[PDB]
Design a protein around this ligand. Structure first.
Ligand code: FAD
Ligand code: FAD
Ligand code: YI6
Ligand code: YI6
Lengths: 586, 586
């Protein structure tokens, strides 16, 4: 296997140096490279078990077995004498810049995954370009560099969640002795939006600075892969040109879907528009039941909105359904209305007032499964009915990249597509969890395999999640119903408990927060899934994901001592099983 | 070993049944016991690897080898026929109540550990009494059942920490769009105290109800162990009597120390008095540098107090000193003054006004190591200079219980004292971490070994902690300096990073929150200590304690994916080492 790895590493690395830590001839080459500002990867053979064997395999390319050995784009360049010869004759810069292609790496898409891959690749001498373009929404909304999470996703959504949580902080403060009266305080949407957008703007600018500081070429242009190594770009002035690259990373993400009903595209909005909206939505209808739908409905209600969610069937399809129902019950008891078993069939009553920054007015007609008609007026209608890629705008079908039935890219476990120099990461990689830290880990780990000879793969199993509804829901691993389907009801034991945050006592609910561990009896009570509904649920859940990755059992949870007073410590003392029928209430 | 375990189990259990899950004769005995309301332990031999061997060892007591076998206080009572004979003749209740002693267990001390041990023991048929008495402070303060944490410790301190955190929530809410002006809002101390004390009162009452519901005798009396099995009790009317018990658990805790200077006991207060104080402390001096000292100084300043901390030498002796200095720097930048390298030499200027609920006024004289005099007026002076047991008031020295030089009880790893029926748990157990969840785990696990034949010991290693200062500090495992002392500087690698909570962006500090992993190079980069300074630090830290208990390495942290956006996810991507000299700032 050693020989196969070395051949792949030499073929793909842009600039790479084989070395030993204790060799003065290697030091001399490093100093020349440092002075000339030549970035490169380095592999220290004296820190590898099979380093002696690698030293022999190197002779298949260089006909020598000593260190140092320097390679550029698959070609042996020289030992120490030869490298210093090139440097002394002012020939070295031209050798390390020689390529059949314009770039070692072209990244199509400047989001979570693409920016992480491009920055990491450039560290090892890969000449890199990042392409990013934001097709405007139907009403014209657009934004800067950084992708979905930065501009219209995790970042603004959690900041508006925090604004909503602060409504209940204001209420709590009265009970803890502060002299304010919450019922006399109001919220100003546009003041919130301006502060959120100023933070987003600092991130757009920080990414541009980071790319320039890493010598990455940033092009604000739409990319299209027309052959394995050729990318056609269209710029802001609609000028069309072509650039070539050795490795290609597709990282173009997804966009919101709309239902195929009259008025939907003309008069409704999506999450893409919500986070920069210049007016407060007012009385709002959210159509959908995804985590995006419930997160947005939740903070709009906490900011004083009259909010309704229209649910076709169930909440949070794909998540543990006991936990999903508890999430929804909390919202319904705290100001969110639900139109259940209902679908839409949108009429305009008032145009948006762009001068006084006020919403319009819409009539929504729909129907319930029991035959009743739905007809109600709303100032704003938000569609959260899923997201999809549009790779036909990105990828000419004659290139040979395989897609699945949902339009996502079919990859091997190292992110390789059916075209061997082309890779796909992030939301468009079929079958993978669609999360920002997954995209970042995939992109950074792939850059190291391509340009630094690394072997580590990304591990996509048991990736922890948190839904940032008014009461947050964190999870790691299998739902209870999925565990029972996979292993049988007789092999599953479930420990559970309600709890109450100490913070909620003086603030005046008892038995609403909830947690459970889903375990496998025949495998030493291995923890298969962890679930918690409560405040700060993402901070609670994160550390347990390390223990689950290492194969934690119920016994491991039992022997660990709790930190007091915290919500998380309740996981360390669980004892009530579902099989026993004993109530989980306090 | 099996034979040794069985002999210890039979000798100590109050009422115990040896059984198999699939035996109808065992079921008949269980049903008789259930009907007569006889609580007992049960050991199902068909779920134990050595169950066949136990069945043979049982014949050393009963001369039979079949199940069921029932034992009471070390004596074989009967098989199924014999038990039903006693029941039919109305003889069973008298047999299971027969004892040489008044109680199977007497717990001296009704705090975290003692209440947990007493409740658990009663579940297995142990006739139990819990003794609790609260000696008043010098100014006369006293409180109800539940011990230090419930009444004058973790519970009120974290609730007043929450009141302090809500001051910064009120400030943050303006930036997130809410229409309040923080500079016009004030805090009412006595309103806060009344709400905190109403929650504490519900806990005092809940413990009394829980003891009655478990058939535990609660005596509000001071206990003194005068011989191995005899406890002399003094009640509220000063009546003195004696009760006897088979097993004794000492669980009497500690109380605050005072410095030996004029005026200290007469005019100062301690944490015992602070949490029910009927007046706002006003301008306050905290003498001390423990976690109690800094937690109390921190919330008093956030509630609008003019607060000074007088520090003899260093902050948080025994904790990681880099982290302790960061804790202190945050406080000094956020309204707490520090009188460094200073000690006190207290004069009264004004008596406390108990009618208008206002503080008095004190003159504090002291001196600095550089020779300068300290002289300043304060309305309240709080001593936080350590805690100590007073076991000579609890334990007659002729009984034979060994104490260490600090007056704490010297125990084996199963909490046994040098008197073999006497055990010690909680803060008075020498060498153990002095924390509430440790006391609870020790007490519950000991009750199961005494009365249900369990073998599990409490694990006191790598117990995680959190200091609830204005910016919280969570830790699990070794400090950096302790790791380097134990293993050598060359065998230690430290990964670290600053971070910024997303919540702090719109609210307007960058590089103040901080985390680090202290690892051992020669043991696969094993994580020896984890440290985090940031919001919700106890929720962050707790889950990682399970992974550290299982022997997590840096590689385990790397392969686990983060949850976004959270503070805790920064642990999953650490890469800067201290050895490299690269800055940890963002
Ligand atoms: C409302 C919402 C909330 C979310 N909240 C969370 C959360 O709390 N936590 C979490 O982990 N994840 C969250 N996510 C998911 C997270 O945003 C995505 O998983 C992540 O953005 C995926 O990154 P990516 O690199 O695959 O693509 P993206 O971030 O979508 O980046 C792709 C970029 O490429 C551009 N592009 C597309 N086609 C082309 C082309 N032809 N040429 C040039 N550029 C092109 C796009 O315009 C975009 O800028 C949320 C998503 C949404 C919608
Ligand atoms: C200010 C402060 C804050 C703290 N915060 C935390 C925190 O956040 N987290 C944490 O884990 N720990 C915290 N602790 C520590 C925690 O309170 C203790 O570790 C815990 O209370 C130990 O319990 P115990 O059962 O050993 O004793 P205790 O809880 O002290 O109970 C002993 C009881 O026995 C009584 N007693 C004594 N002598 C006799 C006698 N002769 N007869 C009858 N009764 C008697 C005492 O009056 C008392 O009621 C804090 C402590 C303090 C002081
Ligand atoms: C546009 C590319 O179309 C493809 C469709 C399917 C495959 C299936 C396979 O790899 O066997 C490959 C390529
Ligand atoms: C009051 C009891 O005094 C003791 C003091 C010391 C020991 C030391 C030992 O156990 O060897 C035991 C008992």
């Amino acid at each position: 296997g050693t020989s196969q790895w070395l051949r792949k590493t030499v073929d793909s690395a842009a600039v790479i140096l084989f070395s030993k830590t204790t060799c003065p001839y290697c030091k001399k080459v490093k100093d020349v490279l440092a002075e000339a500002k030549i970035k490169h990867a380095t592999i220290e053979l004296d820190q590898l078990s099979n380093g002696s064997a690698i030293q022999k395999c190197l002779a298949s390319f260089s006909k020598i077995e000593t260190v140092p050995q320097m390679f550029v784009r698959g070609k042996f360049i020289g030992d120490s004498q030869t490298v210093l010869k090139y440097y002394s004759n002012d020939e070295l810069a031209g050798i390390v810049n020689e390529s059949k292609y314009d770039y070692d790496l072209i990244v199509i898409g400047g989001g979570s995954g693409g920016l992480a891959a491009g920055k990491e690749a450039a560290k090892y001498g890969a000449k890199t370009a990042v392409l990013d373009y934001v097709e405007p929404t139907p009403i014209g909304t657009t934004w800067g560099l950084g992708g979905t999470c930065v501009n219209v996703g995790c970042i603004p959504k959690k900041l508006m969640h925090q604004a909503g949580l602060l409504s209940h902080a204001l209420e709590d403060a009265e009970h803890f002795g502060w002299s304010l009266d919450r019922s006399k305080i109001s919220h100003n949407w546009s003041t919130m939006v301006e502060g959120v957008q100023s933070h987003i703007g600092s991130l757009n600018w920080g990414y541009k600075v980071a790319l320039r500081d890493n010598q990455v070429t940033y092009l604000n242009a739409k990319g299209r892969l027309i052959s394995p190594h050729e990318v056609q770009i269209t710029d802001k002035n609609q000028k069309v040109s072509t650039i070539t690259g050795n490795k290609i990373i597709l990282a173009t993400g997804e966009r919101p879907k709309y239902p195929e009903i009259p008025g939907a595209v003309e008069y409704g909005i999506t999450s893409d528009d919500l986070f920069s909206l210049p007016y407060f939505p007012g009385k709002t209808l959210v159509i959908g039941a995804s985590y995006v739908a419930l997160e947005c409905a939740g903070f709009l209600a906490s900011l004083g909105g009259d909010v309704t969610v229209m649910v076709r069937s169930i909440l949070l399809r794909g998540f543990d359904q006991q936990m999903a129902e508890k999430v929804g019950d909390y919202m319904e008891n705290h100001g969110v209305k639900f139109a259940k078993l209902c679908v839409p069939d949108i009429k305009q009553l008032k145009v948006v007032d762009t001068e006084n920054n006020k919403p319009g007015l819409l009539l929504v007609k729909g129907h319930y499964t029991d035959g009743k008609k739905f007809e109600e007026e709303f100032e704003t209608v938000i569609f959260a009915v899923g997201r999809e890629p549009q790779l036909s705008k990105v990828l000419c079908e004659t290139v040979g990249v395989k897609l699945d039935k949902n339009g996502r890219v079919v990859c091997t476990d190292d992110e390789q597509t059916t075209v061997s120099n082309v890779y796909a990461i992030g939301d468009i990689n079929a079958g993978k969890p669609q999360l920002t830290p997954v995209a970042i880990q995939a992109g950074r780990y792939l850059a190291r395999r391509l340009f630094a000879g690394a072997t580590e793969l990304t591990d996509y199993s048991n990736v922890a999640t948190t839904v940032f509804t008014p009461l947050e829901y964190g999870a790691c691993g299998l739902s209870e119903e999925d565990a029972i389907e996979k292993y049988g009801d007789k092999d599953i034991e479930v420990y559970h408990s309600n709890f109450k945050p100490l913070e909620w006592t003086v603030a005046h609910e008892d038995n609403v927060c909830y947690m459970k561990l889903v375990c496998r009896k025949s495998d030493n009570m291995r923890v298969l899934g962890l679930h918690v509904l409560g405040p700060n649920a993402g901070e609670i859940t994160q550390g347990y994901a390390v223990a689950i990755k290492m194969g934690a059992t119920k016994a491991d949870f039992d022997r660990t001592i709790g930190i007091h007073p915290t919500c998380s410590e309740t996981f360390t003392t669980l004892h009530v099983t579902k099989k026993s029928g004993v109530s989980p209430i306090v």
